[PDB]
Amino acid sequence: KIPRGNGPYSVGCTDLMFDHTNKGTFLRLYYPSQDNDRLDTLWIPNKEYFWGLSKFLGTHWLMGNILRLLFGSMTTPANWNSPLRPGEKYPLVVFSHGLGAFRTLYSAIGIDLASHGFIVAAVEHRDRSASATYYFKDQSAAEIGDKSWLYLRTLKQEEETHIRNEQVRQRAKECSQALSLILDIDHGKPVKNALDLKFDMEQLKDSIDREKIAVIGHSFGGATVIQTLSEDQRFRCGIALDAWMFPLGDEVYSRIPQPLFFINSEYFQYPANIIKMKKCYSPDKERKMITIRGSVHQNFADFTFATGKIIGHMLKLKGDIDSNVAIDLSNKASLAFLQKHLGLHKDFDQWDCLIEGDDENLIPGTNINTT
Ligand SMILES: CO[C@H](CO)Cn1ccc(Nc2cc(-c3ccccc3C)c(C)cc2OCCN)n1
Numbered sequence: 001k002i003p004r005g006n007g008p009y010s011v012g013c014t015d016l017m018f019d020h021t022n023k024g025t026f027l028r029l030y031y032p033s034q035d036n037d038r039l040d041t042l043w044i045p046n047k048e049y050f051w052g053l054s055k056f057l058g059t060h061w062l063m064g065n066i067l068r069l070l071f072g073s074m075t076t077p078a079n080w081n082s083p084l085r086p087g088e089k090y091p092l093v094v095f096s097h098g099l100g101a102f103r104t105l106y107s108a109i110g111i112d113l114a115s116h117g118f119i120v121a122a123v124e125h126r127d128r129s130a131s132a133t134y135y136f137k138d139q140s141a142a143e144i145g146d147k148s149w150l151y152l153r154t155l156k157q158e159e160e161t162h163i164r165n166e167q168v169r170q171r172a173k174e175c176s177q178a179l180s181l182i183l184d185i186d187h188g189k190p191v192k193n194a195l196d197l198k199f200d201m202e203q204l205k206d207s208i209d210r211e212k213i214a215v216i217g218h219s220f221g222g223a224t225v226i227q228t229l230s231e232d233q234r235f236r237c238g239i240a241l242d243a244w245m246f247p248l249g250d251e252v253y254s255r256i257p258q259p260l261f262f263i264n265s266e267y268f269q270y271p272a273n274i275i276k277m278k279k280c281y282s283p284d285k286e287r288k289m290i291t292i293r294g295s296v297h298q299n300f301a302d303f304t305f306a307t308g309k310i311i312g313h314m315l316k317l318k319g320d321i322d323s324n325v326a327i328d329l330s331n332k333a334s335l336a337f338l339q340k341h342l343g344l345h346k347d348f349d350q351w352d353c354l355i356e357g358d359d360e361n362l363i364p365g366t367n368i369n370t371t
Pocket residue numbers: 053056057067071098099100101102105219301302303306307315316317
């Protein structure tokens with residue numbers, strides 16, 4: 001089970017694609033919902049995502065069919081296409097997935113943020129860092145639902161520096177474009193969802209607290225946080241979840257004026273990666289960093305909830321720490337940081353102590369020795 005969210009709000013989920021092309025925006029939306037009696041949301045909604053996942057894991061596509069047998073009917077606890085809870089403007093998180101991931105795999109985070117009164121746009125990237133993604137070749141294909149699939153690109157070592165940087169730059173543009181789409185929907189622009197879904201986008205009119213925007217992301221998505229902040233001042237702060245810093249260009253490090261929070265796992269991090277995070281530091285800039293004791297890279301994504309404890313540890317999906325305990329720490333510390341730097345009038349300051357790593361299961365800063 002993916003956990004249900006700790007906040008007072010019920011949670012809805014839908015998908016938005018606009019336009020229908022490989023250059024349009026594709027996102028999964030999590031939002032405070034009016035109702036709590038809908039079907040739960042299908043977690044991995046297409047067989048081709050399983051084919052993509054099997055390629056990312058270095059197996060034959062036929063392992064994809066076995067993963068689909070084991071996991072293809074798994075749901076996540078969000079009310080599919082539930083009406084948006086009316087009467088309040090909601091702050092906005094744009095969420096960026098990791099390498100080999102896609103938009104639906106960070107529902108534990110997306111659901112928890114939404115249960116606290118956030119709208120969450122989990123983008124699906126078309127830079128070929130997703131395990132799989134889809135789009136429509138033209139208007140005809142979109143009408144009849146003829147999906148074109150785009151699979152993970154594997155790189156030779158000589159391509160790494162250049163291609164990861166091209167990708168992080170496209171990822172930032174995709175975050176900015178997703179922001180402009182949501183803001184235009186908030187400002188009443190008619191948008192026809194390229195997906196035929198029973199959630200009217202007109203509900204979102206006048207529903208965004210338009211100055212309260214953050215970008216959050218895991219791993220490749222953590223580097224996406226930083227590139228996005230340096231390029232788009234509409235984002236007011238960022239939270240990098242176990243950032244993979246390698247994609248970033250040398251130019252970005254001195255160019256991040258917004259508050260930035262690094263939330264790390266204990267076992268993922270390494271000196272080259274920590275050195276790049278420290279390069280973001282400057283006396284005039286707000287920076288915070290914590291490490292979750294006993295945690296692994298996968299504690300930030302939904303695979304940590306997908307299996308039992310023993311299989312979980314073996315597959316490196318779980319750490320020594322309990323998965324619910326770890327994600328509560330990451331989500332609560334995130335809520336307190338967002339309250340501080342977005343100026344929210346909520347009770348998230350009860351977790352201010354966590355921003356400073358003051359908890360038995362937190363390390364302030366990093367366990368990683370550099371120099
Ligand atoms: C969230 O995306 C991360 C971003 O960092 C990248 N990513 C993709 C797949 C993966 N890991 C992984 C997943 C699965 C899996 C696949 C489908 C359904 C359920 C599960 C559980 C299994 C069996 C094994 C897996 O890993 C085995 C090597 N350690 N990570």
